[PDB]
Amino acid sequence: MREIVHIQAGQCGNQIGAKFWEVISDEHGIDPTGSYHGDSDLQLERINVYYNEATGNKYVPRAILVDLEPGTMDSVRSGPFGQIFRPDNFVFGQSGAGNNWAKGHYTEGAELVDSVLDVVRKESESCDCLQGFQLTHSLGGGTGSGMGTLLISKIREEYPDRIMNTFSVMPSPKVSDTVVEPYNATLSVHQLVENTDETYCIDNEALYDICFRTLKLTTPTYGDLNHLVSATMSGVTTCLRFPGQLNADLRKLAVNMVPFPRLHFFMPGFAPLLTVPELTQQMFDSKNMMAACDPRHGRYLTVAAIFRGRMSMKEVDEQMLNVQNKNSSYFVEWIPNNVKTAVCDIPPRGLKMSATFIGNSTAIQELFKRISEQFTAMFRRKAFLHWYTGEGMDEMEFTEAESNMNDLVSEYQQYQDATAD
Amino acid sequence: EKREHEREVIQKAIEENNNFIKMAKEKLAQKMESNKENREAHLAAMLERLQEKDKHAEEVRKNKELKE
Amino acid sequence: MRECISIHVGQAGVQIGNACWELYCLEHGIQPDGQMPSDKTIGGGDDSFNTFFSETGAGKHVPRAVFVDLEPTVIDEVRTGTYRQLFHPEQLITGKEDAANNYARGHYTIGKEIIDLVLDRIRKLADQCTGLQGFLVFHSFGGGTGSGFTSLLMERLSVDYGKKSKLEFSIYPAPQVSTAVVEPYNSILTTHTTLEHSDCAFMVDNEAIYDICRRNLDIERPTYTNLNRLISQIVSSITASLRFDGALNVDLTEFQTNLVPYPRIHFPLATYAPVISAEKAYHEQLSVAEITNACFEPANQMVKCDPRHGKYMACCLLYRGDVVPKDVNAAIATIKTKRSIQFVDWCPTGFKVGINYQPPTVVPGGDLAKVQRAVCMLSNTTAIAEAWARLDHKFDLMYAKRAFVHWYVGEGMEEGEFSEAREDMAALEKDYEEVGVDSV
Ligand SMILES: Nc1nc2c(ncn2[C@@H]2O[C@H](COP(=O)(O)OP(=O)(O)OP(=O)(O)O)[C@@H](O)[C@H]2O)c(=O)[nH]1
Ligand SMILES: Nc1nc2c(ncn2[C@@H]2O[C@H](COP(=O)(O)OP(=O)(O)O)[C@@H](O)[C@H]2O)c(=O)[nH]1
Ligand SMILES: [Ca+2]
Ligand SMILES: [Mg+2]
Numbered sequence: 021m022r023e024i025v026h027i028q029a030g031q032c033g034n035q036i037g038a039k040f041w042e043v044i045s046d047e048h049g050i051d052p053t054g055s056y057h058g059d060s061d062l063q064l065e066r067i068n069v070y071y072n073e074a075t076g077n078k079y080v081p082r083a084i085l086v087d088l089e090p091g092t093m094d095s096v097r098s099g100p101f102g103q104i105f106r107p108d109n110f111v112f113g114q115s116g117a118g119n120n121w122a123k124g125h126y127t128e129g130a131e132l133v134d135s136v137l138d139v140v141r142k143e144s145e146s147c148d149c150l151q152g153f154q155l156t157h158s159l160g161g162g163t164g165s166g167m168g169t170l171l172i173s174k175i176r177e178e179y180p181d182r183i184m185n186t187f188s189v190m191p192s193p194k195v196s197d198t199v200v201e202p203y204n205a206t207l208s209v210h211q212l213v214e215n216t217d218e219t220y221c222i223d224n225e226a227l228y229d230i231c232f233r234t235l236k237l238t239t240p241t242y243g244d245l246n247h248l249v250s251a252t253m254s255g256v257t258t259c260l261r262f263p264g265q266l267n268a269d270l271r272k273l274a275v276n277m278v279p280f281p282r283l284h285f286f287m288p289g290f291a292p293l294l295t296v297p298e299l300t301q302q303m304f305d306s307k308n309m310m311a312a313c314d315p316r317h318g319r320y321l322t323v324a325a326i327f328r329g330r331m332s333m334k335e336v337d338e339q340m341l342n343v344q345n346k347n348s349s350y351f352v353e354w355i356p357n358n359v360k361t362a363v364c365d366i367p368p369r370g371l372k373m374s375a376t377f378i379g380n381s382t383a384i385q386e387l388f389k390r391i392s393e394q395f396t397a398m399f400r401r402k403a404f405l406h407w408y409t410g411e412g413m414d415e416m417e418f419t420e421a422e423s424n425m426n427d428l429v430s431e432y433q434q435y436q437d438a439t440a441d
Numbered sequence: 442e443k444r445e446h447e448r449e450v451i452q453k454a455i456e457e458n459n460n461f462i463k464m465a466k467e468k469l470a471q472k473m474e475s476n477k478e479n480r481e482a483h484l485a486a487m488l489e490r491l492q493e494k495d496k497h498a499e500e501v502r503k504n505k506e507l508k509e
Numbered sequence: 510m511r512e513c514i515s516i517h518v519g520q521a522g523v524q525i526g527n528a529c530w531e532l533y534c535l536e537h538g539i540q541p542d543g544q545m546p547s548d549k550t551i552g553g554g555d556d557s558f559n560t561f562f563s564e565t566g567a568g569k570h571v572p573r574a575v576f577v578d579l580e581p582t583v584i585d586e587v588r589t590g591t592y593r594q595l596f597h598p599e600q601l602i603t604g605k606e607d608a609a610n611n612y613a614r615g616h617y618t619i620g621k622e623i624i625d626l627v628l629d630r631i632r633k634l635a636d637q638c639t640g641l642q643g644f645l646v647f648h649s650f651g652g653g654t655g656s657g658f659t660s661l662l663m664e665r666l667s668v669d670y671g672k673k674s675k676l677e678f679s680i681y682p683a684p685q686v687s688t689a690v691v692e693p694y695n696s697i698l699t700t701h702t703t704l705e706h707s708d709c710a711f712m713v714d715n716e717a718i719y720d721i722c723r724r725n726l727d728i729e730r731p732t733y734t735n736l737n738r739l740i741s742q743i744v745s746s747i748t749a750s751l752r753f754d755g756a757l758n759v760d761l762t763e764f765q766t767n768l769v770p771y772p773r774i775h776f777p778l779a780t781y782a783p784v785i786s787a788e789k790a791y792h793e794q795l796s797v798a799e800i801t802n803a804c805f806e807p808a809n810q811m812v813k814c815d816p817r818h819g820k821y822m823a824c825c826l827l828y829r830g831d832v833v834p835k836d837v838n839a840a841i842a843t844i845k846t847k848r849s850i851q852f853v854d855w856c857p858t859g860f861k862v863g864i865n866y867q868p869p870t871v872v873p874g875g876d877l878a879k880v881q882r883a884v885c886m887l888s889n890t891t892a893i894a895e896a897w898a899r900l901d902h903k904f905d906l907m908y909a910k911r912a913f914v915h916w917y918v919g920e921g922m923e924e925g926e927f928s929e930a931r932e933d934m935a936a937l938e939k940d941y942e943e944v945g946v947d948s949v
């Protein structure tokens with residue numbers, strides 16, 4: 021009775037989306053035909069947050085799949101669980117986005133948008149009580165970025181009192197399928213600052229470096245990255261999917277995580293990439309962050325943390341207290357009790373103990389600076405711009421987005437420098 | 442004189458229970474009124490911003506058409 | 510006659526009510542289906558337990574209660590649970606969507622959609638009463654429903670029942686069991702808003718209850734169920750006067766007279782004893798003198814404050830069980846020699862005593878020894894103001910940066926309500942300072 025509506029858009033969005041569904045379906049005891057063959061009542065208690073009930077007592081993801089070209093989506097059908105989706109929620113076009121943001125947002129994306137909208141409505145109107153939406157996408161492409169943001173906006177007009185939550189994948193020049201990717205990223209961020217309630221900042225840079233420098237994969241695949249992305253996505257939705265003494269939903273989380281509306285960009289973390297103390301230490305280590313930022317180069321405004329496994333409640337309390345105590349400089353003092361903790365009895369598949377971490381840290385500015393540096397290098401020598409005015413855009417709109425993003429950095433800095441007295 | 446003082450005391454107690462109830466009732470109505478107003482103005486401003494963004498997306502498609 | 514109606518609001522209010530009503534059923538010998546073999550009066554009566562329980566023709570004893578929450582997950586467990594036959598479905602009221610830790614949603618946005626129906630159900634309880642005495646309202650400070658909806662409700666109840674008495678059991682937030690960073694906000698707003706509508710409010714500091722569960726019962730990591738089970742023993746102590754009767758029994762309202770010297774100064778400090786495990790109680794009768802003694806130990810208080818550093822305006826002792834006055838008077842005499850309990854110069858120094866003969870019970874499966882005697886002290890001391898100070902301090906740290914405030918403004922609140930609530934609390938802190946200063 022607290023429904024979320026999921027939307028995957030474009031290449032990245034559909035792949036990480038698919039993985040997400042796989043992982044959580046396994047965790048909930050749901051097969052590719054959509055049947056419950058599982059062992060605990062706990063897997064079903066809050067199953068409708070993500071799944072609809074059906075005919076032949078089936079469970080169907082409340083998911084909508086979206087792309088400007090059928091490529092990635094047929095692989096979705098062909099893939100396992102491809103059969104679990106609802107064939108009407110496949111909304112695709114033909115002409116594609118051609119890795120161009122203006123195409124996602126203004127042109128071809130704009131031609132496809134209403135059919136997505138119609139399916140969104142079909143899904144919302146069946147909800148007993150709609151929490152809101154989560155969109156998986158990338159900010160480097162054209163569909164995911166441009167059309168994902170256009171979607172966000174359009175959905176916001178129709179459900180302005182629902183929570184909008186994004187999993188947004190950030191472009192690194194290591195694993196980097198283009199060159200205009202800073203333009204696309206800046207353009208998307210500009211939108212995101214205004215229209216999402218909460219954005220999980222998933223950085224390919226950080227994903228790459230984890231696989232390379234830590235996991236020892238000298239040549240990391242999209243599959244290796246998305247493995248990381250899926251463990252994370254599982255981690256941060258654990259409190260939505262399972263009954264706790266916390267009751268989480270997207271609004272409560274936003275309320276406890278977002279102290280100023282614009283500052284809603286989160287640094288996720290995961291451990292292991294094993295004892296509670298080690299779990300706790302690694303989980304706060306810059307090496308375990310899914311966004312490529314050192315939390316010791318900033319300060320935490322807020323943090324949510326969840327431990328999965330069977331472990332001592334008392335020990336976790338002690339470790340989390342310890343971590344705040346011994347690192348007190350890295351948490352702002354003007355937000356008392358800004359670190360929250362949940363425990364879930366059920367571990368993810370393949371582990372005995374994990375830990376997932378969500379940070380609202382001003383060190384995230386590092387990430388927006390990276391995109392800002394690259395972006396500006398081009399733009400100021402007006403490199404590759406025709407691609408954009410190509411579709412009717414003005415230069416102004418590039419200036420406005422860069423400003424907005426520099427404004428966001430300025431703001432994160434300002435709250436980082438702020439003191440109690 | 443004493444009976445009339447008796448009457449005064451008890452009518453004063455009624456009057457005060459009443460003015461308290463009244464005041465409360467008004468205070469509530471004013472706050473709920475101001476509340477609905479404010480909330481509405483926030484939604485309206487949000488929808489206005491969105492709608493400007495729609496209009497702007499016309500002037501970007503209409504403008505690509507004017508390069509031909 | 511002399512009925513009391515209990516309203517449990519939000520998660521904490523509800524779960525605490527599960528605990529309290531389970532305990533009451535056990536104290537009175539009422540079975541989970543509501544039958545009570547000992548009541549020969551069928552379909553009604555005027556025994557003391559009828560203050561809290563209505564009777565039906567079928568012999569079911571029905572709480573004079575209403576449970577209310579803005580989402581259904583917690584009350585569903587009552588509808589489904591062991592005691593589900595006790596209530597009529599109409600006493601259990603849920604919406605679909607909660608207040609999301611937001612006082613605005615509780616008082617306005619979501620809450621205004623259900624307030625009429627709640628008042629209507631409460632009115633159906635009041636119509637069954639031949640001499641309604643007042644309301645008992647259970648809620649947390651920190652939740653959106655517990656703060657906002659409770660406030661809205663109290664204002665509405667003042668409107669619909671006048672100066673008919675309203676008492677609070679209010680759950681003050683602790684960082685160990687906390688659920689939202691915005692609890693100080695919700696706490697301040699609800700305290701400011703309800704202050705004129707409440708006659709007496711008992712604060713229960715979750716950190717104190719928590720500390721007590723760790724220390725006296727060796728519970729490594731206490732749950733809501735541990736806390737609630739202790740809280741309910743305290744609430745039972747406080748309501749025993751209404752629910753039972755005997756010669757030495759002294760009505761709560763009579764303590765209330767001594768407890769509230771000015772309308773705003775209506776927050777008594779409770780202290781309970783003994784809290785002890787079965788393990789530790791086996792082969793130890795704790796005498797009147799020991800439990801009386803332990804009432805003056807700050808580690809046994811519902812609220813963390815230091816009464817040694819404030820002044821007393823009142824001191825009440827509420828005994829239950831195997832207790833006779835002679836012992837009490839001896840114990841008090843000893844305390845008075847060995848402690849310097851200091852009062853303000855404008856009030857007398859006596860202790861007010863009451864004794865209920867009916868011994869405490871426990872709920873099976875619990876961690877509390879079943880003892881022969883117990884005591885709750887209710888005192889009014891200026892020290893309780895420490896608990897306002899801490900909360901106010903937290904509010905300030907966030908408010909000075911306007912942190913999270915946008916969530917409240919988004920629901921139609923103004924900053925003015927915040928500054929106005931914080932000014933009221935500042936004035937309350939100053940009142941607590943002034944009552945303790947010696948006279949000219
Ligand atoms: N002692 C005790 N405290 C509780 C319990 N449940 C919640 N709390 C405390 O209450 C505060 C949170 O308020 P809740 O009652 O959970 O919130 P609510 O009234 O349901 O409001 P919303 O859910 O936001 O609509 C926190 O300080 C919790 O520690 C309980 O069962 N026992
Ligand atoms: N982590 C991850 N990143 C991806 C994946 N697929 C594409 N990307 C990234 O997506 C960005 C380009 O967007 P893409 O999804 O390919 O374009 P779209 O289909 O127009 O949304 C690049 O920065 C890629 O590195 C994936 O499966 N995992
Ligand atoms: Ca012993
Ligand atoms: Mg691509």
Ligand SMILES: [Mg+2]
Pocket residue numbers: 519520580607608652654
């Ligand atoms: Mg709740």
